[PDB]
Amino acid sequence: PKALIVYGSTTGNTEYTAETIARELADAGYEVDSRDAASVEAGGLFEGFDLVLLGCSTWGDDSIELQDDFIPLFDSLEETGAQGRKVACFGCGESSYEYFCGAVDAIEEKLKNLGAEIVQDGLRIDGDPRAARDDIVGWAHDVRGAI
Numbered sequence: 001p002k003a004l005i006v007y008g009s010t011t012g013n014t015e016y017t018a019e020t021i022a023r024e025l026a027d028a029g030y031e032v033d034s035r036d037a038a039s040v041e042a043g044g045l046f047e048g049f050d051l052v053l054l055g056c057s058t059w060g061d062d063s064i065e066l067q068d069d070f071i072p073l074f075d076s077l078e079e080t081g082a083q084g085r086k087v088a089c090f091g092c093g094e095s096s097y098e099y100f101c102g103a104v105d106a107i108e109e110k111l112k113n114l115g116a117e118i119v120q121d122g123l124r125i126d127g128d129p130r131a132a133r134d135d136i137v138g139w140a141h142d143v144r145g146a147i
């Protein structure tokens with residue numbers, strides 16, 4: 001199959017997390033197209049993939065704020081082709097914030113509402129992603145299995 005990973009990451013944690021997910025999926029036979037959000041265009045971005053993995057980190061405080069490069073992508077999520085698309089969502093952040101991995105919640109939320117098939121609950125990394133490598137890998141293994 002073809003899986004599309006797109007991530008918004010500012011200190012490279014979620015990017016690190018995407019790359020490990022990309023590797024797991026590619027080890028299991030998939031063709032994996034991994035792309036930073038800052039380099040993509042929403043209009044038809046999911047066209048042709050069987051699996052779309054979205055990746056974002058959380059900024060902000062009192063309300064949910066998304067990583068700046070992911071914002072135009074989230075604002076045009078209706079134009080990507082999410083309808084019927086097997087999807088799953090991930091993101092790094094810090095549990096001391098009110099909204100722990102809040103962006104993960106706002107994307108899964110917008111997706112569900114656009115008719116996507118959320119194949120697994122999002123992966124919410126707290127702190128250093130390198131300390132949670134088993135979790136990322138395990139979560140990739142589980143998304144592959146469900147689709």
Ligand SMILES: Cc1cc2nc3c(=O)[nH]c(=O)nc-3n(C[C@H](O)[C@H](O)[C@H](O)COP(=O)(O)O)c2cc1C
Nearest residue numbers: 010011012013014057058059092093094097100101
């Ligand atoms: C100003 C500020 C606001 C933040 N807000 C949140 C938050 O609201 N929720 C959350 O889970 N983490 C929050 N974080 C945690 C960061 O997202 C955390 O560093 C995360 O790993 C960054 O992941 P990344 O290298 O993939 O970009 C915040 C950090 C800063 C500086």
